[PDB]
Amino acid sequence: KVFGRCELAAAMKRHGLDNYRGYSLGNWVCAAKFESNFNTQATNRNTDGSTDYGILQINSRWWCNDGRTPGSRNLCNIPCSALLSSDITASVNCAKKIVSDGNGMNAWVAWRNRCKGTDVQAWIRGCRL
Ligand SMILES: [Cl-]
Ligand SMILES: [Cl-]
Ligand SMILES: [Pt+2]
Numbered sequence: 844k845v846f847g848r849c850e851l852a853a854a855m856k857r858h859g860l861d862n863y864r865g866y867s868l869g870n871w872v873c874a875a876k877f878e879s880n881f882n883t884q885a886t887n888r889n890t891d892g893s894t895d896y897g898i899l900q901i902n903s904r905w906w907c908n909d910g911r912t913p914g915s916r917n918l919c920n921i922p923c924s925a926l927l928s929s930d931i932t933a934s935v936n937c938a939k940k941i942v943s944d945g946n947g948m949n950a951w952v953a954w955r956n957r958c959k960g961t962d963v964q965a966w967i968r969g970c971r972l
């Protein structure tokens with residue numbers, strides 16, 4: 844599923860991401876934009892052999908089990924395919940653990956390179972929430 848901007852923002856807010864650990868909602872939406880372009884089915888391969896999955900491109904080295912990532916964890920205790928559902932619950936829950944791990948949203952390199960220090964409020968501009 845490909846979300847709209849405000850559709851995503853609303854789903855994320857409903858799931859408790861708005862100001863989770865101080866990261867306002869626009870941070871999460873901006874991160875989704877530049878990770879998956881709002882597409883729950885996005886997958887990308889990492890140079891280390893791991894794969895990123897879903898709306899927030901959550902990675903198999905640490906976070907989910909895809910069955911094919913040697914010497915890797917499954918810290919969110921989920922199959923990586925659960926991260927491609929049109930329902931974002933598992934991506935959201937897993938991101939809360941990721942962003943609580945010590946590095947915050949810097950764990951998402953696109954957030955750090957493209958959202959951090961920008962006018963992220965623009966990503967929620969005009970949305971009914
Ligand atoms: Cl959803
Ligand atoms: Cl949730
Ligand atoms: Pt939802």
Ligand SMILES: [Pt+2]
Nearest residue numbers: 857858859932
């Ligand atoms: Pt939820």
